[PDB]
Design a binder for this molecule. Structure first.
Ligand SMILES: NC(=O)C1=CN([C@@H]2O[C@H](COP(=O)(O)OP(=O)(O)OC[C@H]3O[C@@H](n4cnc5c(N)ncnc54)[C@H](OP(=O)(O)O)[C@@H]3O)[C@@H](O)[C@H]2O)C=CC1
Ligand SMILES: NC(=O)C1=CN([C@@H]2O[C@H](COP(=O)(O)OP(=O)(O)OC[C@H]3O[C@@H](n4cnc5c(N)ncnc54)[C@H](OP(=O)(O)O)[C@@H]3O)[C@@H](O)[C@H]2O)C=CC1
Ligand SMILES: NC(=O)C1=CN([C@@H]2O[C@H](COP(=O)(O)OP(=O)(O)OC[C@H]3O[C@@H](n4cnc5c(N)ncnc54)[C@H](OP(=O)(O)O)[C@@H]3O)[C@@H](O)[C@H]2O)C=CC1
Ligand SMILES: O=C(O)CCC(=O)C(=O)O
Ligand SMILES: O=C(O)CCC(=O)C(=O)O
Ligand SMILES: O=C(O)CCC(=O)C(=O)O
Lengths: 459, 459, 459
């Protein structure tokens, strides 16, 4: 070996491997242990220096990455993250998860992830442009419409996708679906901005219907959300549309929580959206209307929302990895939370997951908190990216209604697959909800493992 | 010149050329003689050494080929054959036929064929993997989704397609529709396994309806099939579904014939399918149930089925070229056979064809045996390969019902084209069935010849 | 950031940076601090999975790497290491050093390094072949005669270069100087096998002449060598040719030391060379003649040679990084060692270097132990690799005498450059030997930094 310490990647791997072991999978297919050893080493990783010029004319250096983890099911597919935390460990955890998430969409997409330790905060739009130009000058050699199709993630919006696309087209002299999250007039898809957040809510709708035998829905439920970017914004919007209340949003500096009964409104979400476009914090808008209304809003510096929202019915962590601790998980259970789905990749700590899963095993039916992993619940974004690829390959643009209908079908099938797979391989006690994390992991892994075997990646 | 002796290719060429001469085609378009001279020389042929390692660690050498015969109508398209007989002559006959077959599908596909003298019999799956890896290491330079799209044929199943695809993706670093016959989760098409055999039966349904003025169908007919691989299996299944009886299957070592009235069943076909997956002979399963039941089954070592089935209504040779001799053709006529369609490429000897065509000319209406050439009747496989390409380019997967409906329409149009073209250019005597071989040949040739002229390949 | 822990890389970086700071370089050119920040992040790194088949038919997985550190002065250039320790940290230290080493040769070569955690020990030649085939199947995309030219290093001999070259030629369909260390009939260079070890000895000849005002040479000196592979073998041979005594060799399991006065002979070195070709340990040949002669040889299991050789005049660590500890450095000083040059990359620990450099500063003239860094002393290998590239580009083969003459000139110029640069930028006290480590580091760094500035890599 001897291998570097990659805690985030190791966490993701261990949770997958644990769920596979705690099932009948390896009794039925013990040869899949070999598949697991092979799939866990990325097919290819590219790391590269990115030199770029700041607004003062000074040289700056950052590190760029693209992890091309697995391509059995399709070209590598997954986002780009621009955040100062970024390193290979983080991108490997993300790319690894992406393989199995993509498998659950039913579309032909392999798994990858990339990005940079470039921090968009405090940069001008001009600085972001120059950075994206330099970044893509190297990345374009390694990607392409039938090769690897990136998109956004934390710190990468349609703005950055644009600058990246422009430079790709300039060097490669091809106009194609090399990126998704593109602008509406230059190959974007309707519903792509909404897709991840909408999908998370669609998925939880199925969880609620199943756990409650159709007796409950989002109507009248209180939903605590974290983050305030793309996933959080549209998850919030969909909750509101379905008659639920959104009782929190947050960012890296603090939480903005509804004080009492009430909800964010669509108009408030749009103000927050514009603030985040400008790369400003929630803290910067709580001094003026509407967010200075202390009757409606409480801003809590340095906090996550989970312990401050009081009673809640659904939690949708939608910011970043490891944002629900073991202690926070218990608080949510004590607050009456019965549904927790990850908008963020690896949003729950392992302690949180263990807490939720023990609770499910101990409490029959609708008394349990039911946990859905990000690879199932947040797959709507990448699914609609696949549809953007489909549109670009067709050279046509579909309607909002057409894309949204497909998104709904994909989320329904993903839920059913996880539910039915857990019922088959990890059969719960009578009256106990099946494990959606175990089911989703087995369903995604087996699809990839079998395609790998067919293609001679292992034998 | 001076040109090598290529008997199979010369046979295919001479039969095409003869049908074109025995028509009014060259009275109307004498310049098409030039097209015939040009189209008959392949655009490109690649031959290459394939070195591979056996399970004992020893070097082995085989010969690889890809004949890229014509691309006027589309990228080169056709299968790969792994059989010890393979040489350039055989692959040229196959690739030549493929040009005109592909033309009759209505899809944009040129004609090609390839393969190796590698013999899968007696090899382990590991040996087949290593062979496919080495084979594609060279072939990948020459093929691609808009260039040349291979598939299976004799000795190449989904297993080999998988190993080939994996190695292509590894070297070329593109995930695309470079092969067809792919697995369901990695870009395959529903109905592709069924397509060739289903199509042959769909085509003969039209022949029966026409010859009998709608009075007869497959219902109650006895159907003698040869081979026991992909084409034979699904032709048998479709016959059974339509209420016909399948009275024979065969392989290279002997024939397995129904003893009396009766049929293979779907369950028996599946047992035979699994035996052939394991590369075992029919001879190896006749010692145990159900095939050891001598009341139902008679295994005849060294024989073809045609003279041993007694009375039959339809014959579908579905194994290999030149598998119905002139004497066998007469026996089938004496046995009451009224429909003969080639599942196999060039399944009938020239003596057989001449016998069938003389019989058609001598016997009005439904009294004639009606012969359909492989380029018409077996075109369903390549047609569904075209639809697999279409699906891969759309980045979506169609339903079984959608693919099957298109397959039915393609086979209907192919029949109508051959029938109507023969009625126009080779008008039969009153009451005599038109020549489907002449009609199909003229219809395919003229479409290619005219596209070639448009593209400046001849003038 | 936040960056992974890469101790080997950090060690190499810190030693370079320290020598640059302890000089007048940044007084004269403070802008070179920017160059240092840019040059220290590799231009590109490729990591890739390598799946290969063992002699039992089982799947095995290893990790492959190529670090393409800097290309200002030429295409990336440096070896491949196959050793179970390999990881990115180790390859970054090696590739970083390579940039500056290559700069000192005077040839147009950038810096890189690659390899795998594949362990050649215990593998058959067939297993090594299959591994190299799989390795190059991915690596060939990233390298080429004007792009990146690998070669051997630990665990990669002409045998592996051959298997790698064969697979490159098969996929890329170009015969070119993509690798060095090639075989004599297929583009190799005479003197390349000898070059590294010969060069180390040539370099030390200059050190001895300078320190002793021409009064001493290798004639009559006792030379302790570590390792027993390519560098150690030919360093030993050259010492013997010059009338010196080689008093030790070693491998990863122990040291083989001359017992008393005496030397390894060329015939003994050839026996050891054949043992290492077979990937066997020194321990396996000490039970038979000649090495079982306890009067001449003492095998010491688990030891390095430095404390067991008694009095010595020159030490040439030629095995691996960090193989002379601080305590061993003091023992060598106490044993009368006056010259220490690294055959191995980063052979001395930082404690050893500090000890040697303090001794030089404290002891005038020939009383000092004089330390030469690997980037100066071991540059003969890569220099002759450059000449192999030159020969391949000329399409001609030079004589042994021609290559060796150029090698001698390159080593002389490298010594003079390090000596003169230290005299200019880090002027020692009267009578004190200039620092060859400081001089070599400044000379290599400034050449790269200035070329980078010219090319717009920093400003
Ligand atoms: N966009 C998509 O389609 C997909 C995204 N995801 C995942 O959803 C999550 C959110 O992504 P997305 O909305 O697109 O990204 P955005 O950059 O639009 O928003 C990220 C939000 O999370 C906060 N955040 C980011 N890093 C941290 C951190 N280290 N600590 C605390 N808060 C943090 C951000 O606050 P601040 O501005 O203060 O840093 C911001 O409010 C991620 O886990 C992402 O991988 C899941 C599938 C699809
Ligand atoms: N698969 C497809 O989509 C297409 C195939 N075809 C043609 O259909 C025919 C059958 O192909 P397919 O079913 O796919 O192939 P398979 O390899 O699946 O089956 C071939 C069958 O034919 C037998 N066979 C092969 N060679 C000989 C031979 N020299 N002598 C006697 N019997 C032989 C085989 O027996 P054994 O195992 O003992 O050798 C086996 O039963 C061929 O002519 C093919 O070119 C037509 C269009 C499409
Ligand atoms: N070959 C070249 O042209 C160049 C090589 N170098 C450097 O010279 C040194 C030797 O390389 P080279 O002779 O080519 O390689 P070889 O593989 O031919 O020999 C390496 C020697 O060092 C021993 N060795 C390797 N790793 C260790 C270890 N972790 N611990 C203890 N002993 C070890 C080996 O013993 P064992 O077999 O028991 O592992 C063997 O005797 C390396 O530092 C290399 O990077 C410098 C410039 C050029
Ligand atoms: O659309 C994509 O490719 C990626 C969406 C995303 O960021 C994710 O799945 O984590
Ligand atoms: O699907 C294909 O490309 C080929 C099918 C086939 O083997 C044939 O038409 O002969
Ligand atoms: O010849 C080469 O490219 C490399 C020689 C080597 O292993 C080194 O300089 O460390």
């Amino acid at each position: 070996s001897n291998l570097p310490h990659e805690p985030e990647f190791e966490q993701a791997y261990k949770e997958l491997a644990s769920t596979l072991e705690n099932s009948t999978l390896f009794q039925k297919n013990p040869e899949y242990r070999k598949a697991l050893a092979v799939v866990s080493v990325p097919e290819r990783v590219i790391q590269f220096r990115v030199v770029w010029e700041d607004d003062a004319g000074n040289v700056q250096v950052n590190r760029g990455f693209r992890v091309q983890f697995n391509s059995a099911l399709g070209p590598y597919k997954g986002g780009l993250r621009f955040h100062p935390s970024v390193n290979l460990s983080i991108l490997k955890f993300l790319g690894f998860e992406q393989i199995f998430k993509n498998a659950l969409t039913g579309l032909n997409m392999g798994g990858g992830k990339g990005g940079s330790d470039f921090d968009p905060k405090g940069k001008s739009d001009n600085e972001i442009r120059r950075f994206c130009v330099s970044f893509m000058t190297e990345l374009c050699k390694h990607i392409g419409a039938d090769t690897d199709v990136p998109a956004g993630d934390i710190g990468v919006t349609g703005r950055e996708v644009g600058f990246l696309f422009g430079q790709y087209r300039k060097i490669r002299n091809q106009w194609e679906g090399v990126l998704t999250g593109k602008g509406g007039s230059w190959g974007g898809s309707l519903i792509r901005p909404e897709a991840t957040g909408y999908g998370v809510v669609y998925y939880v709708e199925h969880m609620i219907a199943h756990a409650t035998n159709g007796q409950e829905s989002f109507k009248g439920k209180r939903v605590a959300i974290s983050g305030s970017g793309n996933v959080a914004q549209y998850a919030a919007l969909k909750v509101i549309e379905l008659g639920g209340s959104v009782v929190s949003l947050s960012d890296s500096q603090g939480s903005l929580i509804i004080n009492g009964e009430g909800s964010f409104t669509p108009e408030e979400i749009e103000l927050i959206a514009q603030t985040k476009v400008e790369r400003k914090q929630l803290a910067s808008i709580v001094g003026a209307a509407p967010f200075s209304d202390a009757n409606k809003f409480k801003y809590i510096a340095g906090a996550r929302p989970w312990v401050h929202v009081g009673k809640v019915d659904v939690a949708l962590p939608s910011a970043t990895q490891n944002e629900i601790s073991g202690e926070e998980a218990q608080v949510l259970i004590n607050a009456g939370c019965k549904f927790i789905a990850e908008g963020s990749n690896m949003g729950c700590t392992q302690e949180a997951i263990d807490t939720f899963e023990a609770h499910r095993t101990a409490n029959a039916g609708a008394a349990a908190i039911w946990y859905a992993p990000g690879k199932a619940a947040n797959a709507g974004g990448v699914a609609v990216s696949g549809l953007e690829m489909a549109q670009n390959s067709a050279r046509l643009s579909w309607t909002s209604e057409e894309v949204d209908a497909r998104l709904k079908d994909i989320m329904r099938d993903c839920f059913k697959n996880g539910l039915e797979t857990a019922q088959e391989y990890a059969t719960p006690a009578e009256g106990v909800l099946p494990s959606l994390v175990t089911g989703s992991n087995i369903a995604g892994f087996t699809k990839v493992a079998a395609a790998m075997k067919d293609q001679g990646d292992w034998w």
